[PDB]
Design a protein around this ligand. Sequence first.
Ligand code: HEM
Ligand code: HEM
Ligand SMILES: Fc1cccc([C@@H]2C[C@H]2CNCCc2ccnc(-n3ccnc3)n2)c1
Ligand SMILES: Fc1cccc([C@@H]2C[C@H]2CNCCc2ccnc(-n3ccnc3)n2)c1
Ligand SMILES: C[C@H](O)[C@H](O)[C@H]1CNc2nc(N)[nH]c(=O)c2N1
Ligand SMILES: C[C@H](O)[C@H](O)[C@H]1CNc2nc(N)[nH]c(=O)c2N1
Ligand SMILES: [Zn+2]
Lengths: 403, 404
Amino acid sequence: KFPRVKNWELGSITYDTLCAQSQQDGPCTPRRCLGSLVLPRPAEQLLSQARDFINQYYSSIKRSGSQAHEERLQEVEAEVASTGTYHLRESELVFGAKQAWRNAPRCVGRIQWGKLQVFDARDCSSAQEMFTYICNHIKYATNRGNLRSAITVFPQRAPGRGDFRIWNSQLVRYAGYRQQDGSVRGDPANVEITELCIQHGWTPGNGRFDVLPLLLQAPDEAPELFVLPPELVLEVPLEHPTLEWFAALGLRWYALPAVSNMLLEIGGLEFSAAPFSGWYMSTEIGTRNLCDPHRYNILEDVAVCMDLDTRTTSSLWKDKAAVEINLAVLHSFQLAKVTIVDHHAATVSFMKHLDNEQKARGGCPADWAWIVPPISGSLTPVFHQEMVNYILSPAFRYQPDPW
Amino acid sequence: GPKFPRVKNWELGSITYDTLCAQSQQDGPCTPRRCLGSLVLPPAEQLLSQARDFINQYYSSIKRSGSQAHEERLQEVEAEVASTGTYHLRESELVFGAKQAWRNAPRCVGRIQWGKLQVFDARDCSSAQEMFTYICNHIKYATNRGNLRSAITVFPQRAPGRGDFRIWNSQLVRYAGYRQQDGSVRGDPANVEITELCIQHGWTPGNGRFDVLPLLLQAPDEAPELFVLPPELVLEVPLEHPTLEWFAALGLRWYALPAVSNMLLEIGGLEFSAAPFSGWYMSTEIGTRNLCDPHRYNILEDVAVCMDLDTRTTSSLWKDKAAVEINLAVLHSFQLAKVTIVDHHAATVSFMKHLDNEQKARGGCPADWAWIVPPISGSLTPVFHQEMVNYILSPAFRYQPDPW
Ligand code: HEM
Ligand code: HEM
Ligand SMILES: Fc1cccc([C@@H]2C[C@H]2CNCCc2ccnc(-n3ccnc3)n2)c1
Ligand SMILES: Fc1cccc([C@@H]2C[C@H]2CNCCc2ccnc(-n3ccnc3)n2)c1
Ligand SMILES: C[C@H](O)[C@H](O)[C@H]1CNc2nc(N)[nH]c(=O)c2N1
Ligand SMILES: C[C@H](O)[C@H](O)[C@H]1CNc2nc(N)[nH]c(=O)c2N1
Ligand SMILES: [Zn+2]
């Protein structure tokens, strides 16, 4: 019933009892484990999800069974009975957003979970207003390089009405231009979104690091294009502490990691546009974004500037170049006074979070394959830590692309 | 469309479906409620159905399903179980089964080599002394003066009303771990218990960082007997670095032959409690895990100090830098010494070729992503980007409790 979780570096053992509170099935069965997969393959339901969330909320403020708790359940029930849905109070919304971050099994930054600035954008009626809200989010979150975690929450989904959506997967993303020679200029992950922007009237550049406009969509309307004021998008030129030629590569990356295509679920309510941001863990940039074969793919270039032997895998040229690239990102961000956390510091804080959560809730949902960094896996403490994965609500969730 | 797990490669955008998992007869640890896949360790009628299933697998592999010889073997196996409670594998059945168990092992990245496995039948073994002889032969053959060859030696199966053949050591070759008076450990902390067991059984212990352990071998219903491997049979490689000249002065070394000796080999319901197998190392096994794990030799800080790195801050990436050079040293030294080894790049590439082979041959391949992805430079290898389905097929290798 209760999974036994072991750390193999320390020999310590916990028991996850929190998993029992999961109301949603993952993709695994006793026959086969599908844990390495990236994506998933009435009014009484909503009401039960609502009562549960409201119960969580009043529990969190040490007010269970109190009159305001009882009265709040009646409101929710009254509203659902009459309208098929209900609405959250701002304080409840704030609670729900923090819990969803807390419950996100793939996020290594969760030690920070209680410190989230929540912007209520539920009074938004147009793409233009979404743009204003997003611009303020970016300004606030970026804070001249001293990054602060934030989420802005747009109006919830409603029956038989189009969703508010941000079409971009992040608020800040570099264009990928499919050249005719089959190659890709810029970021290949973004070829499609780049093409949608062009179709909807965007004048493209021809750089490797052209910041994309946002396609914002108000319900049942064509999306609208919005260029971000370049002074809002903080960026960090990449150079290397000891290799002078590195800066010549023309490499750079943006400060603000803001996810804008995930769905936020709270108490049965769904928020289809609720962009959030924290700060980068350096491997996301140095390893995945810059070195993935299907991304900027710079490994061989850097390796050659380092005069390494590309001819054979056994010279570990890839491993060597990857380390210098990650060191460059960390150095550069530190020099530009922009918040960043290395994979060692991050995983150490995550272990502390696991311990905090073990005492607070009896467990912590974690996706080992995502928590372990893409380089130097076993060099970090989380590699040696068993982990249980499961879905708790409030939750962040993937959703289909609006097109 | 298809009612089977959809598996995606995110580097190449290609998709497959695993139909093979439908053949899984054993539940793993996961449920729809929670995934437990990161966990390291999470009656005649029964035997007969396992036996019938294996015999069917065997006759399929030789393309004789439905044949007279197929149906006679089924009747032959059921008769044996009916009168003895158990049965016995033909020689070629054992060879097939051993290979299929390796082919089926979700955690082994070396499975491209699965068809090339030398199977030594030792089911006639009747003493601990004889077990030692068979093991020495295995080591000699498998080591082959550095030109390593995959092999397994199969000792007699569990018999009802009789004690097991057991090799107490977790590997045929492992280094002693001596608990110190200050609480530290000299040698390999992984092997402290087995080391103390060897001493309790009369071994005269050394006091180096790399003393080869003797073997504790247990014949049925007898106390384990102790055997020292003649040093010339145990091939070792002193570790040096191709450019850092001081690395050789660290006096680090590792053994050539990676031989797992404590796992249970299950075929058709028959259980072989002693069936040691060996391949060749993937270099990260030694350079990253054995040498840099905090609870193993833990040499990262020592090497980083020699490299004059800033060990006072995480953001200098001193651990990453040191780990790279250690792995390079491992590869460089094995190659210099002409001892077979494979780096994590070549290994993972070959495993991808294996996935493609198995997709065509069986409609999938059970694989443990957390074990297949190497402990350094994960996303720089192609397997990181490959979704993987994990499930238990049989024949299988399984963990089994330590015999003490
Ligand atoms: C404060 C510093 C933060 C750090 C260092 C951090 C770190 C990370 C990292 C490295 C990932 C893996 C992403 C990937 O590799 O694609 C991740 C995932 C995730 N994080 Fe964070 N995060 C932070 C803040 C936040 C905040 C404020 C939220 C929400 C309010 C959040 C929610 C999530 C979610 C839902 C995922 C999974 C994304 C997906 O499945 O694509 N994180 N985090
Ligand atoms: C020929 C070259 C081989 C290579 C490069 C190789 C590689 C590996 C590696 C890297 C692991 C992970 C073990 C760990 O990290 O602790 C592993 C596990 C495993 N291998 Fe191999 N292997 C090879 C040959 C063999 C052979 C001949 C067999 C059996 C017939 C085998 C069966 C297994 C099994 C059962 C495991 C799981 C071990 C466990 O769970 O503790 N491998 N292999
Ligand atoms: F096609 C796809 C289907 C599912 C997921 C995919 C890639 C994994 C999703 C990216 N995951 C989040 C990436 C990201 C980017 C920027 N910031 C964060 N971030 C910020 C705070 N915490 C995480 N995360 C592609
Ligand atoms: F206490 C424990 C409980 C379960 C597993 C554990 C460690 C993971 C098992 C070691 N796994 C095998 C390591 C190994 C060593 C030498 N050779 C191989 N090998 C040889 C061919 N293929 C793999 N494997 C401890
Ligand atoms: C197939 C595999 O699950 C996929 O490559 C995962 C692995 N772990 C990851 N971990 C993080 N942090 N981010 C990712 O995108 C992925 N991708
Ligand atoms: C907790 C985690 O499951 C454990 O440390 C695993 C991770 N992946 C591994 N992968 C391999 N190849 N070998 C291992 O011993 C482990 N250990
Ligand atoms: Zn699972």
